[PDB]
Structure 1
Amino acid sequence: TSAVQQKLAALEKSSGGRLGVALIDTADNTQVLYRGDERFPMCSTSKVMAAAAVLKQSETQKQLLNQPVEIKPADLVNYNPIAEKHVNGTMTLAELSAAALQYSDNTAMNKLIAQLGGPGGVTAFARAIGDETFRLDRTAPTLNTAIPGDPRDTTTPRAMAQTLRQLTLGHALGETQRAQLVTWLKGNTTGAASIRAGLPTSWTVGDKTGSGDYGTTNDIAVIWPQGRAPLVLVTYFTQPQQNAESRRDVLASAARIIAEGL
């Protein structure tokens, strides 16, 4: 047990929930893990994998991101701030990717999933890029039920950090596509209370949040510290009762501990 792990354990003890953390520091290609091999519900952090899979498809179809997708009234689900403006109209796969990532639009996510042939298409892409842990089993919003012990729509912090590094900093995607994914993540609207809140202001962050039942509060980020090589950081948090409140502050505190421990 390292000093950073001891701090994270103390944070977890006082939070009342279960915390999972994985850091990869690309300066030295080392990792720091807390419950790194335990499974957690991804919730909407899974949208990164779906968007990335569509970006991969776009490497062999120049026009794919411009392809229109029909949005029908029946397509709207529980949280659709972008798609609802386009009902009885269309959105392109680029628009759907941006809406899913930057606004966490669930209708947009479902269109990405459908473009990949269902949740198992997202899992297939994960396997193709070397992630044997990730699984997507359901569409939105049911992928966010986050029931303790349920393997559906889960990954581990270790696996997710490794994948997010490959996607954003490594060569899982082509150069154009990697840059597009990074642009999207950096433009996220939903992240300032989560990992971002625990880091010095000068550091730049691209991230995707998630949340679900059981007070599940997640964030996965690529971080460009001031004067340091990039980091990838996953923070997952889930609680024992179905109706628990979100705890984005716990993610911020985990990020703060990680930053202080570099």
Structure 2
Amino acid sequence: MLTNLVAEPFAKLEQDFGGSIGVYAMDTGSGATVSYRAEERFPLCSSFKGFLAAAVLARSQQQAGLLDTPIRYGKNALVPWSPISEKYLTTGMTVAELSAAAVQYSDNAAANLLLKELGGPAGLTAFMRSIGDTTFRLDRWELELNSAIPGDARDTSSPRAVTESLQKLTLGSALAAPQRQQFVDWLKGNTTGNHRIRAAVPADWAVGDKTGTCGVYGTANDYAVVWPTGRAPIVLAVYTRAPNKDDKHSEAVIAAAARLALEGLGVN
């Protein structure tokens, strides 16, 4: 009955935001879920970079030494918003450093370099299929994947699919034991999400998260694995979009939807 408990709060929040909010939250030590537009497609924006790092980790379980491989790249690999890879242009970075850069700073050149190693957007989509995710699709590279065009299913997933895949990758069996904790650690070190899901959780909770911000169509998001102290983890995804290209995204709307979700689950 949790979903019904939050139906009207969510609807009014999305009315004042002026767009659509999609939320899926899951209590793993209870089974409880909260859903609002959880099956609708939303643009992933940079939030695909979390799964990108997971796909790299998965591949590292077969290709020994993959994480320490040095990757050298030219100025032409640089793309707007590559704050980490800009600084190692003259030296190269390892696959693990690119992965951490993609997760924790949304580094765009790092994301494209890793996508190339994985076989492009189809390679990443393939990895997500391999863990049971039939919704996720990545179709383009940075920065074209951010167009967030209304009705366009390219480079989208659903809040529900994002949460289910995140749970499999951070808490379940989709990744081997060291890779899973490495993924968690990268998510925990994220620097871009202080005003989204992290803003809605108590200071003593551990949090790993990945953000996405398309820059257009009021489209922005965050997904997170959240550890209440001494309790079982909560996994959740908050995705927004709006009808007009010039509509602005709201970090506060995302934090508000996270808090609503956690209160709906009864654990806030």
Q: Same fold (TM over 0.5)?
A: yes
Between the aligned residues of both structures, percent identity stands at 53
Do residues 49 (structure 1) and 51 (structure 2) align? yes
Is it true that 1:124 corresponds to 2:126 in the alignment?
yes
Aligned: 1:235 with 2:238 = yes
How far apart are residue 41 of structure 1 and its match?
Answer: 0.2
Q: Deviations over 1:190-214 (max 9, x none)?
A: 1110011122222221100000121
**Cα distance in 1 for residues equivalent to 2:7 and 2:114:** 37
* Equivalent residues in 2 for 1:97-112, closer than 5 Å: 97-112=99-114
Measured after TM superposition, the shift of residue 260 of structure 1 is: 1.9
After superposition, the CA RMSD in angstroms is: 1.1
Q: Which ranges in structure 2 are unaligned for 5 or more consecutive residues?
A: none
Q: Counterparts of 1:150-161 in structure 2 under 5 Å? A: 150-161=152-163
SS of structure 2 residue aligned to 1:146: coil
SS where residue 150 of structure 1 aligns? Answer: coil
Distance (Å, rounded) in 2 between the aligned partners of 1:33 and 1:68: 42
Question: Structure 1 CA distance, aligned partners of 2:156 and 2:223?
Answer: 14
**Alpha-carbon offset, residue 80 of structure 1:** 0.4
CA contact (8 A) 2:137 2:155 kept: yes
* Structure 2 partner of 1:37: 39
Q: Which residue of 2 aligns with 1:180?
A: 182
Residue 89 of structure 1: CA displacement? 2.9
Letter in 2 for 1:45: S
Q: Distance in 1 between matches of 2:170 and 2:192?
A: 19
Deviation string, structure 1 residues 129-163 (Cα, Å, up to 9, x no partner):
10000000011111111111111000011111100
The 3-state SS of whatever aligns with 2:13 is helix
Q: Which residue of 1 aligns with 2:61?
A: 59
Aligned partner (choices 253, 256, 268) of residue 253 of structure 1: 256
User: Corresponding residue for 2:226?
Assistant: 223
Check whether the contact 1:73–1:88 (CA below 8 A) recurs between aligned residues: no
Match of 1:16 in 2: 18
Measure the CA separation in 1 of the matches of 2:189 and 2:70: 22
TM-score after normalising by structure 1: 0.97
Structure-1 separation of matches of 2:244 and 2:57: 37
4+ residue runs of structure 1 moved beyond 4 angstroms?
none
Tell me if the contact between 2:19 and 2:240 (Cα under 8 Å) persists in the aligned partners: yes
Q: What is the alpha-carbon distance in structure 1 between the residues aligned to residue 229 and residue 180 of structure 2?
A: 22
Gaps of 5+ in 1: none
- Deviation readout 1:175-198 (Å, 9 max, x if unpaired): 000000000000000111001112
1:13 is paired with a residue of what secondary structure?
Answer: helix
